[PDB]
Amino acid sequence: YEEGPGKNIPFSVENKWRLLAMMTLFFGSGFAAPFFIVRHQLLK
Amino acid sequence: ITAKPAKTPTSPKEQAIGLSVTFLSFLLPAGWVLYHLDNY
Amino acid sequence: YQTAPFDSRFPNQNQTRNCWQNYLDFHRCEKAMTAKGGDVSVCEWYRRVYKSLCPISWVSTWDDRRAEGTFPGKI
Amino acid sequence: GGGVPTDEEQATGLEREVMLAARKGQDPYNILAPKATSGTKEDPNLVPSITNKRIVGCICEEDNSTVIWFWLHKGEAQRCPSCGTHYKLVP
Amino acid sequence: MFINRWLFSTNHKDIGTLYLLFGAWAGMVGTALSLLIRAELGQPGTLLGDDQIYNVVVTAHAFVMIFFMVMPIMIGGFGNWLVPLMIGAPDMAFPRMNNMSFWLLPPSFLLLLASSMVEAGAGTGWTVYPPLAGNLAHAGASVDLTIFSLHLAGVSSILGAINFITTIINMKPPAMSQYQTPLFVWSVMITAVLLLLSLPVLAAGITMLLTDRNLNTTFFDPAGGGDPILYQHLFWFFGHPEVYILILPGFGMISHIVTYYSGKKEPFGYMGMVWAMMSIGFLGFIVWAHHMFTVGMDVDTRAYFTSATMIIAIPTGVKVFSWLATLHGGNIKWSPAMMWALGFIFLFTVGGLTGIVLANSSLDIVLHDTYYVVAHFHYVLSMGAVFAIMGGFVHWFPLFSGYTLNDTWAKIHFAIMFVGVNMTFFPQHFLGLSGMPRRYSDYPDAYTMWNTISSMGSFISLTAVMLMVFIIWEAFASKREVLTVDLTTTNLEWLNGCPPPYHTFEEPTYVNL
Amino acid sequence: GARTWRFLTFGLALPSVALCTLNSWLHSGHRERPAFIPYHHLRIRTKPFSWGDGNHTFFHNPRVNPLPTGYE
Amino acid sequence: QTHAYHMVNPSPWPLTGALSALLMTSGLTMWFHFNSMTLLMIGLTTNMLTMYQWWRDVIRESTFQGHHTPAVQKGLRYGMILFIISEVLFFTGFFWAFYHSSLAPTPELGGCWPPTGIHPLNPLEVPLLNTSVLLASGVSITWAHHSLMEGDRKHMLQALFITITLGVYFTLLQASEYYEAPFTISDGVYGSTFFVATGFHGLHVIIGSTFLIVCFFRQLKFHFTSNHHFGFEAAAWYWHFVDVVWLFLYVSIYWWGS
Amino acid sequence: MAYPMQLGFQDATSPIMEELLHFHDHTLMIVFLISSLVLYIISLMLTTKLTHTSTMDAQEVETIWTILPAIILILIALPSLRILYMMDEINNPSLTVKTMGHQWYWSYEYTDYEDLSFDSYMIPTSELKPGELRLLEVDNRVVLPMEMTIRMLVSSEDVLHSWAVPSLGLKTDAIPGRLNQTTLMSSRPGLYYGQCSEICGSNHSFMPIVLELVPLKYFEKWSASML
Amino acid sequence: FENRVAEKQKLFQEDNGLPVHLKGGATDNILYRVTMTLCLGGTLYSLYCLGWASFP
Ligand code: HEA
Ligand code: HEA
Ligand SMILES: CCCCC/C=C\C/C=C/C/C=C\C/C=C\CCCC(=O)O[C@H](COC(=O)CCCCCCCCCCCCCCCCC)COP(=O)(O)OCCN
Ligand SMILES: CCCCCC/C=C\CCCCCCCCCC(=O)O[C@H](COC(=O)CCCCCCCCCCCCCCC)COP(=O)(O)OC[C@@H](O)CO
Ligand SMILES: CCCCCCCCCCO[C@@H]1O[C@H](CO)[C@@H](O[C@H]2O[C@H](CO)[C@@H](O)[C@H](O)[C@H]2O)[C@H](O)[C@H]1O
Ligand SMILES: CCCCCCCCCCO[C@@H]1O[C@H](CO)[C@@H](O[C@H]2O[C@H](CO)[C@@H](O)[C@H](O)[C@H]2O)[C@H](O)[C@H]1O
Ligand code: CUA
Ligand SMILES: [O-][O-]
Ligand SMILES: [Cu+2]
Ligand code: NA
Ligand SMILES: [Xe]
Ligand SMILES: [Xe]
Ligand SMILES: [Xe]
Ligand SMILES: [Zn+2]
């Protein structure tokens, strides 16, 4: 296996802009989920 | 701690883009839901 | 008679058994007095106490079960 | 009434290596705590290694709760930075 | 290779990394839930709906913050990364069972999110009391999905506890006694013993709730001779130990951070710190009914639970004073991690003291099921457990990643979060003393000012959470590689470099007697 | 030793099981079932069972287990 | 490596186990609420496949590859002791529920224990026989252990076969007593406590019997040495745990609770 | 009831609530002092360039840090437990009233003499009379005699509720199948408000309690008129 | 039965780079594939069941 900084993680840090997108989707999806569940409960 | 200088420095402009994108990723989806509560 | 006095058998916050015991005591006394055609007036103290302490719905449920033959206490 | 194998007959792999080394009073897999020498420059603690450096933890005085950790390198004896106890790598 | 490494791991560091990513994601869920609470309460009236949607949000907030954020980060994340390194062990005792502790959590979380999506959700409180949580007042699948979520989280933590206790007892260097292991390692061993003993009692109680809901048992149903109060005893017999489980690994990280940034080789009064954590763990099993002072128990029982609960202040005070005595004489480095730790010492002390107020059953009559309790537990959780997590994250991020954070950004982050959590929770003391109940979607008009200020505080905390994500991005974006770390002689976890190799201690440490 | 624990197995433990087997054997056979009384604390039905018609317990014995409405 | 510990090959069984737990729980939900057993039957199948392959691999690692040094064996000893402790506390919850209900019988019961309309089993009939059976099996497993330490293959196999036969006898007697019982799980808190507590105990008897049968086949295949046989020790400790829980159930529920 | 910008407890209406105020004042002084001392000592540890980083002996100082807290806890526990046992003391009530919690309203039963019972529901916000309090008023108040020892028995006919009146120092859980007792004695006439204090579903926020404390003779006539 | 443990020790110590869960041969791969297919397929089915149960 690859060893060293940026290699001991399940996500790539090779490109900071691809990383920003991946982090945006990751943290953003967790923060968004409760709002969309509330929307779901209100729409029944 | 000591550390090397950045291998891929993040300029003030690059930091403004990352901070802006980060904040929008939290604020736009929640803002869309809360704006539309009456509709729901 | 104003209300049910303090009873050293039931000194704590949970008064469930106080209501239950007085309802049983009234109905046992009433059965004992009616069997001989004795006088149910001697049972009056237990009647006043259970009426003071017991929720209306508990009394109503217990009375229904005595009529149905499903009351689980011994009378 | 027999028919159960012994460790001598059937132990294999690392289990067998440990078993055979212990018969010879040897500890290649570091099961035992090594006993200190006087730790002087003349009589250093001898630290076996399969490479050219190994981490030492020094309990400088009996019942210290603090362990002092450092890399010991092949070459001249090094000293514990807290108590000055001498350690020498034996690769 | 990727599947073998990240789905089939037997490596304590990669499993720790999985737990930290899981806990970080859970923290965003729990933050969104916290903002929905404060949005509902931030002006008088109704925003979302009645108490059912409101208490689904409150219930999910608590389960996510406790079971998916704090426990996975402190025990799964810091514990897996640090415990083997701090004892020179080559991995955990049960490296494959360790991976199952991790992989039970995504399914547990999926069952919780399903609970909120089906029917009207589980609006029960995180305590899940019957009969509100029973099959009449919460008909349908929501509460059963919540119970199964708890079952999987509980199996995860029980097997993890077996792993940590075995690792810590059996895999130290042969010369190292239990009294030569670092305080963080003690904090994890004691937390693991609490998990091992408490979670099975929760398992029994929620299983009884499941059979009352689905198999016509009546453990908690008076119609069958059951008792709702029995559920409360079984829940809280777990629930009091659980709050010690939430703070003990924090106490361990605080000891390491205060020692490190004071320039000390060791914490003040090591054996007193061990004694204090074992005393808190023991006393934590004999106090549960301080959650039940209004249920109608006997006066002598109330007297006992008041007295036993107050005893916890003695060992806890020894820890607070020993942290202060560790700072004493230090070469203080005002790192971001040190700021988190100093905030912890003060704000944990405030929340512990409002806990001693609540321990008084007579006063608890008026404070129970009010915002005074909410203020107490958010001082110890949202400013104690969370400040220990943030201090440990900024202290050990360079070890885990091999990269540095921007210390100026991390100090800004601390300052915003410090203002936000205090603005959120300080005014809740006033709301509790003046009688605002828990689990309300709306309040009498008199309570408006403090609810307004509290909600404004919650938005400042949101800004801090958003900035933290940016700060992690900026570290990985810039790639400042670690060179030298000070005090490696008394911090073994740093001695294999940053990050350490996949396999460490293939050759064990040499420690003589 | 093994010899002693075999002595205890065959000399004490299995004889005990044989005697208790005899005891149970001699006390087997059906007792007369009691009058059905629709007590509200028994035959609980807050939700139908997930098998059969929803009203039969999992190891329902028609001879000794009445339904809420009485014996079958 | 120059330590004695086991670096385990990367494994899929933790993930298959975790997903089997999702399928079993979502399956129970689908059975209780959506009238369907399909997810549950997939989850039970993947759970059994996971257990089979995981413990197969532990046997490969130990008997066939030699990774179970004394240090590894000592870890497994602690793990099994800790697991048993967690199981004790799980049963403690059910005993608490039992004592809570029976020491303070509510008016709905008639304010007595046993409740009005409950006819308990005679503790001197099949329950006493079950007690003799599990105690006898504690003696036979001890014979099996000493036979194995003394290197006696035939007597180990005979004693372990007797132990398993008694575990099966207990299970068949309990199944019959469930069918014959005039009270059910729906007979208030008496039925609730009786069936859930004895039912979890019965599940543990089946688990422990299965573990003994695994030991019986491993013994037939010569896996155990006279000094190295942790799977047998662990099965024996588990089996004593099952015995002891039974004695507490017998005294508490069947005798004192009658 | 609470008033805007309130910091502390509602003014005491009962002697036991008076006792709780004085006990809280004593406990809060201790909370303030210990919080303050910890903050001050943090600031003292952090404001000197002088250093001492060698090993420090712990045992002498640990005596002070265990004994002084033990003494403080005893000084809290003594008055705490005096009040606990005072509330539990035998008082001889003049009147017994029952309250039953329901989703989402309270019923009251006054059955010492006659069969008096009624339901007590929140006044909807749209039906409040001018000057009335949002979420706090009820249609039918719990009329009680002032300056008299009253036994309140609390239960539920569905889920958990909790019957609370902060200004009287009262909070008793409402548990189905259980009859919990507390005692109520008002030093004053007036209107005393509380709110359901156990999560009970959709309208937990909207099932308040209003006590109306009046002279015995008014209570007797009201009782007669409510049959 | 005869003691064939030595033959299994040789098989499971063969220097073929296989992880222990596949080192028995082609039957291990089949049972692995069945197990992972039921797990992943079952998980997709559990998600479908949530979708269905999330609406009236
Ligand atoms: C990390 C989590 C955590 C921790 C560590 C604690 C710690 C304490 N808790 Fe808390 N608590 C909660 C989380 C926590 N709590 C939660 C979540 C609830 C609500 C549950 C629910 O209903 O949902 C709760 C509820 C709760 C109640 C129930 C209140 C009610 O519902 O009416 C009580 C009652 O006694 C209590 C007390 C205490 C006490 C005495 C401590 C002690 O351990 C504190 C000890 C610390 C100190 C005292 C400070 C430091 C000491 C000194 C500086 C020495 C000198 C001090 C003195 C002399 C006093 N807490
Ligand atoms: C750990 C536990 C925890 C934490 C941290 C919090 C945090 C917060 N809580 Fe809560 N809360 C509870 C546990 C917690 N809570 C519990 C147990 C209840 C009772 C439930 C019930 O009544 O049944 C509760 C109830 C509760 C109520 C009462 C609801 C009611 O009675 O009606 C309110 C009201 O304002 C509230 C608000 C908040 C807010 C605004 C935050 C904010 O401070 C949160 C801000 C965000 C953070 C603190 C960041 C979190 C993320 C991380 C730390 C991730 C880190 C990432 C890396 C390390 C990479 N919560
Ligand atoms: C020889 C006895 C062996 C027992 C085997 C029997 C059935 C399979 C399940 C066994 C597991 C044990 C306990 C689960 C709960 C209840 C079953 C109790 C034992 C039993 O079998 O009880 C029966 C009822 O079963 C019923 O409802 C059947 C209900 C079937 C579904 C069970 C639901 C599972 C519950 C979830 C378990 C959660 C696990 C928690 C793990 C903790 C993780 C932290 C009794 O029959 P009856 O007709 O009512 O009375 C007899 C009248 N002649
Ligand atoms: C119908 C019922 C279905 C329900 C599912 C559960 C059913 C059955 C599970 C039965 C348990 C079987 C366990 C088999 C373990 C086989 C592997 C084994 O025993 O492995 C041994 C190690 O022990 C070890 O891992 C010890 C491993 C111990 C595991 C024991 C776990 C008990 C599991 C209970 C799980 C569910 C309980 C939950 C109930 C609420 C191997 O070392 P040795 O023996 O020294 O051999 C080496 C020598 O040959 C060298 O000379
Ligand atoms: C607790 C976390 C949330 C905190 C508050 C978040 C702050 C809000 C961020 C912006 O959110 C957006 O706001 C827009 C309005 O400003 C919305 O557009 C809406 O309103 C516009 C103006 O009327 C229209 O043009 C758009 O079509 C319409 O979608 C848009 O959907 C929404 O994403
Ligand atoms: C490896 C991949 C994993 C495999 C995934 C397999 C998915 C296939 C599931 C089959 O779907 C079934 O559909 C049935 C009907 O269409 C349902 O019957 C149930 O629902 C019916 C309602 O029509 C009723 O007859 C009964 O409740 C009952 O038969 C049953 O619940 C459901 O499972
Ligand atoms: Cu009734 Cu809350
Ligand atoms: O829980 O305090
Ligand atoms: Cu507690
Ligand atoms: Na609102
Ligand atoms: Xe959970
Ligand atoms: Xe659990
Ligand atoms: Xe205090
Ligand atoms: Zn030294």
Residue numbers in the entry:
A (entry chain L): 3 to 46
B (entry chain M): 1 to 40
C (entry chain H): 11 to 85
D (entry chain F): 3 to 93
E (entry chain A): 1 to 513
F (entry chain G): 12 to 83
G (entry chain C): 4 to 261
H (entry chain B): 1 to 227
Study authors write:
The electrons from cytochrome c are transferred through CuA in subunit II and heme a in subunit I to the O2 reduction site, which consists of heme a3 and CuB. It has been proposed that the hydrophobic channel that connects the transmembrane surface of subunit III through subunit I to the heme a3–CuB site is the O2 transfer pathway.
To identify Xe-binding sites in CcO, we treated dimeric CcO crystals with Xe under the following three conditions. (3) Fully oxidized CcO was treated with Xe under an aerobic environment. Using these crystals, we measured the X-ray diffraction data at 1.8 Å resolution. Xe8 was near the molecular surface on the intermembrane space side formed by the transmembrane helices (helix III of subunit I, helices I of subunit III, and a single helix of subunit VIIa).
